[PDB]
Amino acid sequence: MQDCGLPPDVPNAQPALEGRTSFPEDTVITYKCEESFVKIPGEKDSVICLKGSQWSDIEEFCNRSCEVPTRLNSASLKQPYITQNYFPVGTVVEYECRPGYRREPSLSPKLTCLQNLKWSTAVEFCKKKSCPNPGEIRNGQIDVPGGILFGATISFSCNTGYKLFGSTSSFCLISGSSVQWSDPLPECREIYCPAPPQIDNGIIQGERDHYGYRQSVTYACNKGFTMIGEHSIYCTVNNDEGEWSGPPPECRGC
Amino acid sequence: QDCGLPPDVPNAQPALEGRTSFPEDTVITYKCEESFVKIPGEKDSVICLKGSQWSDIEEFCNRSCEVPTRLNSASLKQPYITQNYFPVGTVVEYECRPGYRREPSLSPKLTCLQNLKWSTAVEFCKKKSCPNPGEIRNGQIDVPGGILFGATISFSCNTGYKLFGSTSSFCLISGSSVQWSDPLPECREIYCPAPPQIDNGIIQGERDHYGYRQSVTYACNKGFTMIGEHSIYCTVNNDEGEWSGPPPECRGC
């Protein structure tokens, strides 16, 4: 009769019958691979109802493959693997470094689909690029807690008596073709105490324009006046603010 | 042949030894009364002569000031320093003791006034001053009460420095002048012990010396996680250098 019966049973595949058990001549039935199965590229996935109520032949066209290789931050799959989804056991794909990573020549940038349907063990075939030597801050310091490779953070400080002007930290971030420091080296600026206080009936010996950390100012009483107190005071520096060590002496008469 | 009572001398009293009759050749001496001093080169005694007659005697006592009171700034010059006769109008001169100096604008003279008192005393001899103390590098000099003869000053070293030498000085008289009893001490920077090294980590840019408030920053080697403070600083546990705390640790991952 001008109709075929049920199409052939294909291992690991299911046909789309659309609710019927009888099919007219020239009917084309397509099979879909079952769960955990991927169709083999370049193979038929359908049958056709021919004359004599006979279906055309069809061979197993499904496998048995690894999942799409897991997403790496250091490397991306090369072409053509990057567009593929069929990875039977034994399949080896190749990677290439992303930015800002570079190849570790001693290591293979390849992964193999194993018998258990899993990709081989991942090694660091693509490593983190390094940022330039951070250098130095005059009268300050640079803290490098964990190297200077891509993704690293460094911090800046100014020594006692100096004030930081600029950025307090920097990060090694990807910059176009390479990796560079997010921020430039800041500046450590000398902290000045307020102008030293004058005293009644006394003077400052050779008063300077500016007083920095630990610098001192010496007092002297005018003729006929007696000194009572510290002959000199010095500049203390805390939390980036200058402040004299204590009050200036007194010059009492007479 | 015995004389009777000797003559009455104004402002003087004779020493009679309770006697009222005196044999020939008896010599009687008079003593000036209070406030009076005998006049140098004048007779103060009489002698009983023949004819039961005393020899003549004239007033020999002049009202006089007392020996000038002792001053600590100056001493009487010669010859006043050995004198005791100071009638009204007498002016004596002083000279400075050590460690005092003359106040040029003033007179070093005292006059015996009509009331038998010496004129008002002024500071004609003033205390000498020791030289300016100077400065102590990284330290301070406290001058509580001037730098004149007898004064005391004290020395201290700023935070982070240790005093080596004298802690005070006193303005002493030294021969022909006044000088500080002790020379200035020195203020030397205190150093903390060398910072400790840590397993699997380093000291970032270690220095040869660390002083007060100076810090040392640590960093762990690749593949280790730091545990504890990243940097420590040089404190001064008086008067010793000491690190603020233990260095961090590096734990292998």
Swiss-Prot record, chain A:
| GO molecular function ontology, one term from the record | lipid binding
Subunit structure of this chain's protein: Monomer (major form) and non-disulfide-linked, covalent homodimer (minor form). Interacts with ADGRE5.
In its UniProt entry, the species of origin is given as Homo sapiens
Q: How is it modified after translation?
A: The Ser/Thr-rich domain is heavily O-glycosylated.
**Top-level taxon of origin:** Eukaryota
Q: What is this protein called?
A: Complement decay-accelerating factor
Functional description taken from the UniProt entry: This protein recognizes C4b and C3b fragments that condense with cell-surface hydroxyl or amino groups when nascent C4b and C3b are locally generated during C4 and c3 activation. Interaction of daf with cell-associated C4b and C3b polypeptides interferes with their ability to catalyze the conversion of C2 and factor B to enzymatically active C2a and Bb and thereby prevents the formation of C4b2a and C3bBb, the amplification convertases of the complement cascade. (Microbial infection) Acts as a receptor for Coxsackievirus A21, coxsackieviruses B1, B3 and B5.
Q: What is the effect of changing residue 20 to P?
A: In Tc(c) antigen
Give the record's family classification. Answer: Belongs to the receptors of complement activation (RCA) family.
- Indicate the segments forming the Sushi domain, all copies: 3-64, 64-128, 129-190, 191-253
In the record, what lineage is assigned to the organism producing the protein? Eukaryota, Metazoa, Chordata, Craniata, Vertebrata
One annotated Gene Ontology cellular component of this protein: side of membrane
* Keyword Cell membrane among record annotations: yes
Question: Which GO annotations describe the biological process of this protein?
Answer: complement activation, classical pathway; innate immune response; negative regulation of complement activation; positive regulation of CD4-positive, alpha-beta T cell activation; positive regulation of CD4-positive, alpha-beta T cell proliferation; positive regulation of cytosolic calcium ion concentration; positive regulation of T cell cytokine production; regulation of complement activation
Disulfide bonds listed in the record = 4-49, 33-62, 66-113, 97-126, 131-172, 158-188, 193-235, 221-251
Q: Tell me what effect the entry lists for residue 208 to H.
A: In GUTI(-) antigen
Q: Which residues are glycosylated?
A: 63
Q: Which keywords accompany this UniProt record?
A: Blood group antigen, Cell membrane, Complement pathway, Disease variant, Disulfide bond, Glycoprotein, GPI-anchor, Host cell receptor for virus entry, Host-virus interaction, Immunity, Innate immunity, Lipoprotein, Membrane, Receptor, Repeat, Secreted, Signal, Sushi
Q: Which disease is it linked to?
A: Complement hyperactivation, angiopathic thrombosis, and protein-losing enteropathy: An autosomal recessive disease characterized by abdominal pain and diarrhea, primary intestinal lymphangiectasia, edema due to hypoproteinemia, malabsorption, and less frequently, bowel inflammation, recurrent infections, and angiopathic thromboembolic disease. Patients' T lymphocytes show increased complement activation causing surface deposition of complement and the generation of soluble C5a.
Q: Which tissues is it found in, per the record?
A: Expressed on the plasma membranes of all cell types that are in intimate contact with plasma complement proteins. It is also found on the surfaces of epithelial cells lining extracellular compartments, and variants of the molecule are present in body fluids and in extracellular matrix.
Curated annotation (Swiss-Prot), chain B:
Q: Which disease relates to this protein according to its record?
A: Complement hyperactivation, angiopathic thrombosis, and protein-losing enteropathy: An autosomal recessive disease characterized by abdominal pain and diarrhea, primary intestinal lymphangiectasia, edema due to hypoproteinemia, malabsorption, and less frequently, bowel inflammation, recurrent infections, and angiopathic thromboembolic disease. Patients' T lymphocytes show increased complement activation causing surface deposition of complement and the generation of soluble C5a.
Provide the assembly information. Answer: Monomer (major form) and non-disulfide-linked, covalent homodimer (minor form). Interacts with ADGRE5.
Q: What is the effect of changing residue 207 to H?
A: In GUTI(-) antigen
Report the source organism: Homo sapiens (Human)
Q: Which GO terms describe its molecular function?
A: lipid binding; virus receptor activity
Sushi domain sequence ranges: 2-63, 63-127, 128-189, 190-252
Q: How is it modified after translation?
A: The Ser/Thr-rich domain is heavily O-glycosylated.
Family of this protein: Belongs to the receptors of complement activation (RCA) family.
Q: Can you quote a single GO CC term?
A: plasma membrane
Q: What Gene Ontology biological process does one annotation of this record name?
A: complement activation, classical pathway
Q: Which gene encodes it?
A: CD55
Query: Disulfide pairs?
Result: 3-48, 32-61, 65-112, 96-125, 130-171, 157-187, 192-234, 220-250
Q: Which UniProt keywords apply?
A: Blood group antigen, Cell membrane, Complement pathway, Disease variant, Disulfide bond, Glycoprotein, GPI-anchor, Host cell receptor for virus entry, Host-virus interaction, Immunity, Innate immunity, Lipoprotein, Membrane, Receptor, Repeat, Secreted, Signal, Sushi
Q: Which domain of life is it from?
A: Eukaryota
Per its database record, what is this protein's job? This protein recognizes C4b and C3b fragments that condense with cell-surface hydroxyl or amino groups when nascent C4b and C3b are locally generated during C4 and c3 activation. Interaction of daf with cell-associated C4b and C3b polypeptides interferes with their ability to catalyze the conversion of C2 and factor B to enzymatically active C2a and Bb and thereby prevents the formation of C4b2a and C3bBb, the amplification convertases of the complement cascade. (Microbial infection) Acts as a receptor for Coxsackievirus A21, coxsackieviruses B1, B3 and B5.
Effect on the protein upon substituting residue 19 to P: In Tc(c) antigen
Q: Which residues are glycosylated?
A: 62
- What's the protein called, per UniProt? Complement decay-accelerating factor
Expression sites by tissue: Expressed on the plasma membranes of all cell types that are in intimate contact with plasma complement proteins. It is also found on the surfaces of epithelial cells lining extracellular compartments, and variants of the molecule are present in body fluids and in extracellular matrix.
Quick one: effect of changing residue 19 to L? In Tc(b) antigen
Portion held of the full protein = 35 to 285 of 381
Comment block on domains: The first Sushi domain (SCR1) is not necessary for function. SCR2 and SCR4 provide the proper conformation for the active site on SCR3.
The UniProt record lists the keyword Metal-binding: no
